[PDB]
């Protein structure tokens, strides 16, 4: 049902935004961090506190109104993580690596994820432990079974609320997202080094094999992210997730559709 | 089979294929039994629930032939989009895992991993290789028959079809590069105690299944076979015991109709 | 606004420079090093010394003024850039902590950041802090009136890289929302044991042209180079750690471009 | 080894398939694919490694169909190796952490195979040409190995005396020899060495990857006296026994080589 | 000025490493590493200091025609020698095998029509270098960053310590160079061999290094990592580098 790209004056636009991370924000002073991790809980008695759980970030961007078809088509995205050099602060609150040494860098398990779509990101739920008791204010797989630990097709959600869908509960659903592009990399392990690139010269092309990008339903663009950079280690040895915001610059064109 | 032109017609099929890590009880779906070792190659009797197995599913397709004469039509697998499902579940460092140190978070899943998928017009063809030819494998497993010391390198007697779900242990079998004329397979083994899992998800990645002559796997008996193994690494309990953790694999296969000579 | 490339005799020029690192320079013998790192300062009492904070390096390169009174502008088309002295890290005999009894010195290793930019105006920078309550020392330029939101994205923290050895690397990143008139490239690798990995070759050129074939255009006849090359931490025999930095070379090809006024 | 005439005629294709066994030392009948436990000399002056402790290059010569009815003709035909598909066989066998392995910690699983590894193959129309290089020129190598003759301290860097054909299976120690880049005009070789005690093995399998054997002029290895030469070394790393002893583990390598008939001057 | 391409020739060289060679039996190794307690008392011994390798390769005299270097094939020689874990090795644990060569490494080559141009940079300007080494003259604290005084030609084999000198990106108009440094005590060596890999030496204008006084210069440094003795002492290990260079005749005026 996709016809010609529409050219003419005002047939192209670009939108930009910064999406803040949602790492748990355990107090008024620790925006961008989670609560300290509390660990070794039997699978039968696993009740994570809300502020310990990083969640997916999401925002809707309104686009100039079109007449109902003409739709905005997302063609490219430029994206990077904002503030990566903040991790060179080894003087603030971090455990000394040895006597007389500097602080321990942020490191360990990390996840870097973004999506651009013409509708909210479609998610599939998978749990480490289907018996986890998730706290009020989170949205997690509803009424999970043992099969929820591998693949349970009942756990479908839209990423339709910021700071609500825990990263550990949800992945982008590859059986859906017909009208979105998503990219993520998970790296797990205690000593994993964060590796992050910035440049204003890199572009991701969002067109499929037929040269069609995401088409923006009701003239709205949806951006999604999760940038868990790794764990911060306090002098006590406690560990907290650290997250950073993500920048998006999306170029769109008008597309004719039936 | 003499392959003629593409019939201009197209369908997509999809499958979420569950991993078969052993499933030691009703609550540990996706995990193996704790890993336990024989002191010796001569007394090596692994329990069934400790052995991850290859996953496989048969996707039935409709017959395309009005007449069972001359030229026939077969379904041809052209592309696959595939992804491991639930990679973010490893960000749960609060459930059951050993502290990395006092007052620290849980130990991440890490260690030896294997990520493998195949798409074929017939069951995956496999070649047996053993770490230890004297391993005594348990009832419910299908493992190399009458193994010899040569079974630890290459014994051409060990040929099998991946013809049963949750029966062929990953440690005993590999895709056979000498066969699989009618399938495409892809795997990476990463070995070691502290190996970081590195997993990517994107709906922009497509594997083309066409060979040098532009022919994909042909569904000879109107069935398509998807095969997987996704051992993500070892989960370490508070106690120090270790268990394999596996994740489901999604498949989306584009098929077209291919004319062939009767 | 942007028109024809002025093609002709005298229409091209190459400029080169070596930009020194600004790692803190704690005394005149330790040029290229920071002061030893402090640690475990509660977030509420974190007052880093100036000499402990590596800063962005920057130079303004004046170009011939092509305008008496349509205008002509210098356009940056390519850059060749290299970190200088990477082999110095093979010196494991100067003041190293031994890796064990009878063993060699501990190499420089750990968190590193390799960054450069070429632009026709100062680099546009965005402030982000590990700890908004950090009290930065005199002679540094850091986010003004920071809040908890400064630990994520706070759009108040916009600055020009307009002073050498003033903008701490830990406080500032290139702003992806600006820098229309510059090209920047950085990689951050974090961790205690990260191996430095550095390449040299005189066969690598970066094209600075955007999609419409236009390079950075030198406003007020100035070319701006910027860098940060934190190689990792040097560990003394005492066990103290210090940032080590190296200089960065730039060779930029420029051409004359016609623009409208 | 299977030699299949895929096509007859001027556009004849022959596919040669084979599985080359590793030669890790095989210290007893039950430990096929392993070396003898590694033992280190105190120093360079009394370094006498045991035969079964030294992995060796694998090689085989595959005879091909005769092409030339008239040995008298102005032109003769040679088999030309155009492509190879290759992979290491049994990589998943390293997921066996239950057999004979050292616990990683109390109550933990077995230690995986890991550490220094070398993955190498060659396809040629004559034996692989090798150059000798030694860690320690004063090593006394055991009966059954072929190692550099009358080595000097210059043998620890480059000694042009140490030239050899890989002309015997399970005889040329991997630690003594490398492919010679000054020769091998009629072979293609590929190898990666990764050193260190915690190095993770990383091995890929696919039936979709083809290496093209043609040079810049579009010419593959030419099989002299109707002979195709395969060579390999696949040291996966070290297996650690419950005792703490370490042995090399090796795996077999599959080859599928596609050959065509090339006319050359008699 | 470079005119038309005029036929072809090939030269090859096995260039030995210069790791220090602390005695007649330890060719390809350095002296054991020692550390000064302090930057003010840093006097390394000559045999402890790996140096750049170089060789001048004489070319057929012509006649202006000049030899132009078009492609190079290069390979580090003897990488499998590191599978010897039986010779003088420290055990990784009780009953375990020997500790492999690992740690900081540098792999570098250059092909030019004249000697390689170098820039000096020091970790420690106050280092006192020994007789037989050529190191930056009148070093200052600026020698730890960029000091434009420190220019040299790689004109002597086994004289210019790797730790004092880099290729000069502001010069070398008539050479191509390539180097990777990987730092850290547990870095694994990763080395590839193949006779299918060629580096083209032509610039964007199609011109390769032109050989002055009918001479070709090859330069290398191949520090593979540290060898650990059973005592726990550590020595650099180096390996030879092969070069095969294809050259064509070029008319100058
Ligand atoms: Cl749900
Ligand atoms: Cl069997
Ligand atoms: Cl500000
Ligand atoms: Cl010899
Ligand atoms: Cl000098």
Numbering used by the authors:
A (entry chain AAA): 33 to 100, 107 to 296
B (entry chain EEE): 32 to 39, 43 to 102, 104 to 297
C (entry chain BBB): 33 to 101, 106 to 297
D (entry chain DDD): 32 to 297
E (entry chain CCC): 33 to 38, 43 to 99, 107 to 296
Question: How do the authors describe this structure?
Answer:
BK polyomavirus (BKPyV) is a small, non-enveloped, double-stranded DNA virus with an icosahedral capsid formed by 72 capsomers, where a capsomer is an association of a pentamer of the VP1 protein linked internally to a single copy of either the VP2 or the VP3 proteins.
However, two monomers retained the WT loop conformation, while the last monomer seemed to have a state where both conformations are superimposed, leading to two different RMSD values for the BC loop of the E73A crystal (1.2 Å for WT loop conformation and 1.5 Å for the alternative conformation). Thus, the mutation to alanine induces a more flexible conformation for the loop compared with the WT and the E73Q single mutant. Variants E73A, E73Q, and VQQ all showed broader ganglioside binding, indicating that negative charge at residue 73 may restrict WT BKPyV VP1 binding to b-series gangliosides, and that removing this charge is sufficient to allow binding to a-series gangliosides. In 293TT cells, the E73Q variant was as infectious as the WT, while E73A and N-Q variants showed 3-fold lower infectivity, and VQQ variant was barely infectious.
